[PDB]
């Protein structure tokens, strides 16, 4: 059902706390959307595999390309940091 409007978290000056909560709610929803896209990728990959038999290189590679591209991304939300003055790692 319902579709809350995303707020663009970096734009609202951090006192209007309902907007801040709706921003972090929306950002976490966007995280879950890219996650569910990754789930779509895996459900496609299993069907390609069990149709393929031994046919990895035929038509199942190009799933695995953006699969192992998308997997180190699309995981966490954290917080959009203020200034990023000190990097590490």
């Amino acid at each position: 059902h319902q579709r809350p409007e995303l707020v663009s978290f970096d734009d609202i000056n951090y006192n209007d706390h309902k907007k801040v909560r709706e921003a972090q709610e929306s950002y976490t929803r966007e995280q879950f959307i890219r996650l569910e896209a990754l789930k779509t990728v895996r459900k496609a990959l299993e069907k390609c595999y069990e149709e393929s038999g031994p046919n990895h290189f035929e038509d199942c590679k190009n799933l695995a390309e953006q699969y192992l591209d998308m997997l180190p991304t699309h995981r966490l939300q954290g917080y959009l940091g203020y200034q990023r003055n000190d990097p590490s790692k």
Partner: protein, 82 residues
């Protein structure tokens, strides 16, 4: 003799790598035996032996390649002394 090297038939005849060699098409009479039969040893005496003898031919040409490689290395070991 290995008759052919197809590729899309060799995909639709859903066979795997290291069976995807030469003499590969002769699995097509074999497995079509094995599922129409029940892949017992009293399933296909002739048809298994056909593919088996093709594999024997591949083995012997590999032995000839081994002969060539050993001959070249021994002749290099001869020539290196002068």
């Amino acid at each position: 003799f290995p008759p052919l090297l197809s590729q899309e038939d060799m995909k639709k005849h859903k066979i795997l790598l290291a069976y995807r060699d030469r003499c590969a098409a002769l699995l097509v009479p074999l497995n079509e035996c094995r599922k129409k039969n029940y892949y017992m040893p009293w399933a296909c005496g002739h048809e298994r032996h056909e593919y088996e003898m093709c594999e024997v031919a591949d083995f012997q040409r590999r032995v000839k390649a081994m002969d060539k490689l050993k001959a070249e290395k021994i002749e290099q070991a001869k020539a290196a002394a002068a």
